[PDB]
Amino acid sequence: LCLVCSDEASGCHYGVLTCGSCKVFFKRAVEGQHNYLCAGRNDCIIDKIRRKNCPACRYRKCLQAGMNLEAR
Ligand SMILES: [Zn+2]
Ligand SMILES: [Zn+2]
């Protein structure tokens, strides 16, 4: 299982067990820089439903997990 948006995972990448989407999400979101932001709220839980409610929490969540797009 995805350890970010707590869904069915499709392999670990960037050092942590994540889904198929969290890989692509993070890899564009880091080495591209996307605007989400939930630093002014920081309310919502990110899971299998609430992932589509906020793509800010899931960015901070994955990093909390131990993600790094220069991981080993
Ligand atoms: Zn995910
Ligand atoms: Zn949020």
UniProtKB/Swiss-Prot annotation:
PTM text: Acetylation by CLOCK reduces its binding to glucocorticoid response elements and its transcriptional activity. Increased proteasome-mediated degradation in response to glucocorticoids.
Chain ranges of zinc fingers (NR C4-type): 2-22, 38-62
Effect on the protein upon substituting L63P: Abrogates DNA-binding and transcription transactivation. Abolishes interaction with POU2F1 and POU2F2
Protein name, UniProt field: Glucocorticoid receptor
Family, as annotated: Belongs to the nuclear hormone receptor family. NR3 subfamily.
Function as written in the Swiss-Prot or TrEMBL entry: Receptor for glucocorticoids (GC). Has a dual mode of action: as a transcription factor that binds to glucocorticoid response elements (GRE), both for nuclear and mitochondrial DNA, and as a modulator of other transcription factors. Affects inflammatory responses, cellular proliferation and differentiation in target tissues. Involved in chromatin remodeling. Plays a role in rapid mRNA degradation by binding to the 5' UTR of target mRNAs and interacting with PNRC2 in a ligand-dependent manner which recruits the RNA helicase UPF1 and the mRNA-decapping enzyme DCP1A, leading to RNA decay.
Effect of C62Y: Abolishes interaction with POU2F2
Domain text: Composed of three domains: a modulating N-terminal domain, a DNA-binding domain and a C-terminal ligand-binding domain. The ligand-binding domain is required for correct chromosome segregation during mitosis although ligand binding is not required.
Known partners and oligomeric status: Interacts with GRIP1. Heteromultimeric cytoplasmic complex with HSP90AA1, HSPA1A/HSPA1B, and FKBP5 or another immunophilin such as PPID, STIP1, or the immunophilin homolog PPP5C. Upon ligand binding FKBP5 dissociates from the complex and FKBP4 takes its place, thereby linking the complex to dynein and mediating transport to the nucleus, where the complex dissociates. Probably forms a complex composed of chaperones HSP90 and HSP70, co-chaperones CDC37, PPP5C, TSC1 and client protein TSC2, CDK4, AKT, RAF1 and NR3C1; this complex does not contain co-chaperones STIP1/HOP and PTGES3/p23.
Organism, as annotated: Rattus norvegicus
Range covered out of full length: 439 to 510 of 795
Residue ranges for the DNA-binding region feature of this UniProt entry: 2-67
Lineage: Eukaryota, Metazoa, Chordata, Craniata, Vertebrata
Modification sites for N6-acetyllysine: K61
